[PDB]
């Protein structure tokens, strides 16, 4: 339970991985050459970390275990030009000549399953080189059907191969207001049922909410996809901050699973990261722990285009970085219960998880960040996700009436029955999600 295999699927998934490996190298101060970087620390690797994501070699060169799978040669050539490919192994990456489809048709078809056997032995060989395993990490956006289709195929094969470690899947959700791809809601709905059968824990992050964050918190005039990748890198690093650096209250990957997966079918936790602000706002006045904990419940930090006040409270987590006073977060959490911001429940409410780690948060030079010695990463399970589910389901049902595109799907690898089953399954998840929440 000391290794976590991370996979980057799709174009946006590969960019998120590169940002995650870049920030992972920035926190430990790791340069393209390294040998650790260099060998003087203790605790920048070794010891852990890096020994959970970076593979240790005989020479000492940390090789970040990443499997960049994609069928677009342009993205593969881009990630190979940078020093990241030198950090990874040339055999770990998979190259593709012709893109699957637009976008989920061939991404989940048997053509995408031809490489399933190749990447399976690659994971088996990678696991044979290292020792131990804690879980499977996935980084693919639900907007891209190729990334969602291939990422689900990797998730189904890994479930039938080992089935012993909890499978984590970081999913990027498109903007519920505007959708560039017309089949984007179709690829997301068809993938939700597949991740339902395979994924033991998911992650819902919206692109529009991130764009609203950097425009308001970071106060940038022009948002960019690199800024979204950097913010996700700060999110992922905050989740595994305890696994990479020791703290006063070290939490495990099973700790999150025993805090974010509370029901036979509930594996959808929301992510919140506070404080996030501009550098000027930090120069004027500082922020207290109570202000940061109250900022965690705001709709902006929830990284989802929905209001969390209408949702019902469930078991949540809160990871803390750097030096953190135990009573200050205790005095803050009792005020939060007294404020009754989110509608509390009669069964769960005693579930505000507090996790402390000694590693302070790092600010990337590309994207601004509130310079503070302590950061808070809130992993909530509020019932506003069903509202986001029903929001994308209404557009899915409104389109599916005429759907304008059914001839291409039923001809390549799909049929009208699979679309109906995914619709009935998504409606069943929303109904079960409301029933378990409104019964209080």
């Amino acid at each position: 339970m000391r290794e976590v295999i991370s996979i980057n699927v799709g174009q946006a998934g590969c960019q998120i991985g590169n940002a995650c490996w870049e920030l992972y190298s920035l926190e430990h101060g790791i340069k393209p050459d390294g040998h650790l970087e260099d060998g003087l620390s203790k605790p920048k690797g070794g010891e852990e970390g890096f020994s959970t994501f970076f593979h240790e070699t005989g020479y000492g060169k940390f090789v970040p275990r990443a499997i960049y799978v994609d069928l677009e040669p342009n993205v593969i050539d881009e990630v190979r030009n940078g020093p990241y490919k030198d950090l990874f192994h040339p055999e770990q990456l998979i190259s593709g000549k012709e893109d699957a489809a637009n976008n989920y048709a061939r991404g989940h078809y048997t053509v995408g399953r031809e490489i399933l056997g190749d990447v399976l032995d690659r994971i088996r060989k990678l696991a044979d080189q290292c020792d131990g395993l804690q879980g499977f990490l996935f980084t693919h956006s639900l907007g891209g059907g190729t990334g969602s289709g291939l990422g689900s195929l990797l998730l189904e094969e890994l479930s039938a191969e080992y089935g012993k470690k909890s499978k984590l899947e970081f999913a990027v959700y498109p903007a519920p207001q505007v959708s560039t791809s017309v089949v984007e809601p179709y690829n997301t709905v068809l993938t939700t049922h597949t991740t339902l059968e395979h994924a033991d824990c998911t992650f819902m992050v919206d692109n529009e909410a991130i764009y609203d964050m950097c425009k308001r918190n970071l106060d940038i005039p022009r948002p960019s996809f690199a800024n979204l990748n950097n913010l996700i890198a700060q999110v992922v690093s905050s989740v595994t901050a305890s696994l990479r650096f020791d703290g006063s209250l070290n939490v495990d990957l099973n700790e999150f699973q025993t805090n974010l997966v509370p029901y036979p079918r509930i594996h959808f936790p929301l992510v919140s990261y506070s404080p996030v602000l501009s550098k000027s706002k930090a120069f004027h006045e500082s922020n207290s722990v109570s202000e940061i904990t109250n900022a965690c419940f705001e709709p902006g930090n929830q990284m989802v285009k929905c209001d969390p006040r209408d949702g019902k409270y469930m078991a949540t987590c809160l990871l803390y970085r750097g030096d953190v006073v135990t009573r200050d977060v205790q005095r803050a959490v009792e005020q939060v219960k007294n404020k009754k911001t989110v509608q509390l429940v009669d069964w769960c409410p005693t579930g505000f998880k507090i996790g402390i780690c000694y590693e302070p948060p790092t600010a990337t030079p590309n994207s601004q960040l509130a310079t503070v010695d302590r950061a808070v990463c809130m992993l909530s399970n509020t019932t506003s996700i069903a509202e986001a589910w029903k929001r994308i389901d209404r557009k899915f049902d409104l389109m599916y009436a005429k759907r304008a595109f059914v001839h291409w799907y039923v001809g390549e690898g799909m049929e009208e029955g699979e679309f109906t089953e995914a619709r009935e399954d998504l409606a069943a998840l929303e109904r079960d999600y409301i029933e378990v929440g409104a019964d209080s």
Partner: protein
């Protein structure tokens, strides 16, 4: 499947294809001889897409120019920029099509179809990453309307997996050198609506209007119109020419722009289609580019979007623009034009921003719309069909050529099937 071969035919489409290569070597940077001058590596991959790497670092364009009157292809061969042309690229014959749909393919095309298929097969054997064809011809020209419809049908029958993309110019209904010019256009589109999956509508009269307003020239120059449609073609292929925030293939654009195998017709639009020096008077802003794309006369198809109904719209931008800015702009123009834009999709927008910007322009845009008023552009030609040979004038020429009335009624029913789809889907 990243390489695309630019097919060339028609007595006027050859100049469009020649101007296409000229703007290609002028945008990315390439010498007339064939030595590489682009920068740095992404453009070199595009040279592998459109050109062939010859010996001594030379490049040769992958174009198939098949027409008549070899004096024209020899004149453009002596040009400075047209020096890297491979002798196998152009396959010309003798001598003239007579500006008629019959002599283009039925009489002369029967002896050259075997040669042009052997050439396109040799091109397919040398490069296996071919995904689609870019054909520039004249729908009203004799060589274009005759030979163009035959090669498209031959490609569709032999290569059904490969995509189709044409840039045929529509004949002007108001002015015309002869009455047989729109008739050959109707006999051509009778087969183009079945053997082609994608086409672009270009009107010469619309090209004459944009140079009278922006260029402000009395006599329109065909060279400038070739450069305008070249920048349009360059702005369309920029999704594969330069990597951006979201790159889409021609198949990904096709499966999202049409709901049915029909709707091949597309209204073309370029930005910034501003006057010379007007960039200093007016600031280049994205709301201005949207207003130009919404103008009825700025389109070169040309149709009135207000009289019609917006079926599917797609505006691909180039340069440094904000994602949230264009998202708010496209949301505002869809709310204020809710009567024009269709509402059961409900969002029929499909944008693809390019990272780099064209030379001399801080930002560009290529808009493709689907309206229902385009049926009027087919009706006027259909009306000319029933108003030209209804007097049975010059019919002895077509009877001697071997044409019958069965293909004329089939072309009329195809136009009837089109206008029915225009109102299916009512305006």
């Amino acid at each position: 499947m990243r390489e695309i071969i630019h097919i060339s035919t028609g007595q006027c489409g050859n100049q469009i294809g020649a101007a296409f290569w000229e703007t290609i070597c002028g945008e990315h940077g390439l010498d007339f001889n064939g030595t590489y001058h682009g920068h740095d590596d992404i453009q070199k991959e595009r040279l592998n897409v459109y050109f062939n790497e010859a010996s001594s670092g030379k490049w040769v364009p992958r174009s198939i120019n098949v027409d008549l009157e070899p004096g024209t292809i020899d004149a453009v061969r002596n040009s400075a920029i047209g020096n890297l042309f491979r002798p196998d690229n152009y396959i010309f014959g003798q001598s003239s099509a007579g500006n008629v749909w019959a002599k283009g393919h039925y009489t002369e095309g029967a002896e050259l179809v075997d040669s042009v298929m052997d050439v396109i097969r040799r091109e397919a054997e040398g490069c296996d990453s071919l995904q689609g064809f870019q054909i520039t011809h004249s729908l009203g020209g004799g060589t274009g309307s005759g030979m163009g419809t035959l090669l498209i049908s031959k490609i569709r029958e032999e290569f059904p997996d490969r995509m189709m993309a044409t840039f045929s110019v529509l004949p002007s209904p108001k002015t015309s050198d002869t009455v047989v010019e729109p008739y050959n256009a109707t006999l051509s589109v009778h087969q183009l609506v079945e053997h082609s999956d994608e086409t672009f509508c270009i009107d010469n009269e619309a090209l004459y209007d944009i140079c009278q307003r922006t260029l402000k020239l009395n006599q329109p120059s065909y060279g400038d119109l070739n450069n305008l449609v070249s920048s349009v073609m360059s702005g369309v292929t920029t999704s594969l020419r330069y990597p951006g925030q979201l790159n889409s293939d021609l198949r990904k654009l096709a499966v999202n722009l049409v709901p049915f195998p029909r709707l091949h017709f597309f209204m073309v639009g370029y930005a910034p289609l501003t006057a010379i020096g007007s960039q200093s008077f007016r600031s280049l802003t994205v709301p201005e580019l949207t207003q130009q794309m919404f103008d009825a006369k700025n389109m070169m198809a040309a149709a009135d979007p207000r009289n019609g109904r917006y079926l599917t719209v797609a505006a691909f931008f180039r340069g440094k623009v904000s994602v949230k800015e264009v998202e708010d702009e496209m949301h505002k123009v869809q709310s204020k034009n809710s009567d024009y834009f269709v509402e059961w999709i409900p969002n029929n927008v499909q944008t693809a921003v390019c990272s780099v910007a064209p030379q001399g322009l801080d930002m560009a845009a290529t808009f493709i719309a689907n309206s229902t008023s385009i049926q009027e552009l087919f009706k006027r030609v259909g009306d000319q069909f029933s108003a030209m040979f209804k007097r049975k004038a010059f019919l002895h020429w077509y009877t001697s050529e071997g044409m019958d009335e069965l293909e004329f009624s089939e072309a009329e029913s195809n136009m009837n099937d089109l206008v029915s789809e225009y109102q299916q889907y009512q305006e």
